[PDB]
Design a protein around this ligand. Structure first.
Ligand SMILES: [Mn+2]
Ligand SMILES: [Mn+2]
Lengths: 265, 260
């Protein structure tokens, strides 16, 4: 529902659409809580803090008319955003941290790739170029400047931290893209970024590939972005959704937790 | 079926017809921290520590840990934050209907007045005069109070502006708050200061009318905004989604504004 000029303004129409219910708002964010799975690296590396929250007052002696908390966590805690500075191949880009990235990049279209049935039968399942090209045969070309949201239904494991991280003696076993798929998405489709439901955009076992963690290496290496621990991807269409993903303005931040929202029309 | 608005929005952003404005202050240890009388619980200042920096602690990556409060820097005030809004359903940042995280805004410029009086008060007459000039304030819209107070951010003492008789920062009167809520049905109130209420309103017989009445009416607040000088009087669209902190009374957030 828009105006009657050849090239009108969109924001009035947008506001009215959201109010009417023509455009819905979907929450793709997990809840920040002390029970949320915390990533653990081998002991030789520095570790991220888990989410901790402590009450300051609760309408009581400490604060008779108000209630509020202090909290602590890591940049890469829960539903969060990966800036290019996070990886060594993206260290030297000008606007590569969450406080310097051009604000325009915090809003973008998205496509959703559903592989939940495949991951249900293989926790190490790999997203391939062949699979992506078959997707386009059904839903059309992946548009340049769009998020690629990898739906795996992995978010349903959030109640079980052991199941969510899914770690064995040889590391984490989680699904992810092949190097060729990452190269194709960047070079042939010029995507905005890569979004997952897991605690890693890369496949867990890709630490041992010739080029370790290809998604982190190549996406950040090409000044692109990442999203992690997304949920409710099953409520999104294959294409047409619009993502609101603005990270905290942390000085020199390599990433931050954020409230990821999807607009659906 | 066939969408019409969202493709136009994406296209407009890509072509440059629609601009994105960052209304957010940078989170850093040097940013002014809210301070209360010593008998009350205090909010933690923003601190940050490196985990690794492409070194032995993490050969190919860089990342930090950090700690702060829900009410640090540019942040979002939820109705559960105040005792009058504690009983509303969906009153915390994890339970508020997500539809409330996007809303239009009006921008009321009082920079000229505040520059001559640090304790300047937003009154009903000023708002009604504003409407005669820029139209009626629409229901469900943010009321963004421009004071250019954000320019004081480099000086913590000047930003908080506390003297022996409390803080001296601009804000609305009780009548103004009641009017905006009861007669216009606004979405919430947003300011460039660390307080949506006037600093001296702590001593008013009805202390902190904005916090008390706005949250008491299941409405919201934004603190420590900036770049309000780049927004039109009306027509701006605000993106303000708070962190999904479990039972959170608020959170820091990235506040954006779409302008065309
Ligand atoms: Mn991350
Ligand atoms: Mn606050």
């Amino acid at each position: 529902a828009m105006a009657t000029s050849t090239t009108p303004t969109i924001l009035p129409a947008l506001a009215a659409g959201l109010a009417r219910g023509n455009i819905r708002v979907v929450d793709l964010t997990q809840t920040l809580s002390p029970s949320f799975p915390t990533l653990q690296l081998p002991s030789q590396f520095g570790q991220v803090q888990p989410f901790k929250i402590e009450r300051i007052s609760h309408y009581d002696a400490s604060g008779p008319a108000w209630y509020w908390n202090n909290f602590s966590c890591g940049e890469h805690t829960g539903t969060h955003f990966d800036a290019p500075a996070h990886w060594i191949t993206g260290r030297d880009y000008p606007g590569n941290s969450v406080d310097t990235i051009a604000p325009e990049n915090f809003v973008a279209p998205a496509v959703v790739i559903d592989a939940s049935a495949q991951v249900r039968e293989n926790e190490d399942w790999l997203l391939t170029v062949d699979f992506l090209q078959a997707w386009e045969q059904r839903h059309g070309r992946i548009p340049a400047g769009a998020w690629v949201l990898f739906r795996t239904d992995w978010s349903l494991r959030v109640g079980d931290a052991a199941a969510f991280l899914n770690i064995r003696e040889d590391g984490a076993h989680t699904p992810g893209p092949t190097q060729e798929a990452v190269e194709w998405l960047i070079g042939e489709r010029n995507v905005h970024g890569f979004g997952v439901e897991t605690i890693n955009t890369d496949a867990g076992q890709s630490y041992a590939w010739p080029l370790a963690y290809p998604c982190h290496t190549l996406m950040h290496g090409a000044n692109r972005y990442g999203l992690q621990c997304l949920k409710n991807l099953d409520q999104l269409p294959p294409r047409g959704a619009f993502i609101l993903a603005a990270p905290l303005k942390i000085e020199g931040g390599s990433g931050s937790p954020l409230r990821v929202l999807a607009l659906v029309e």
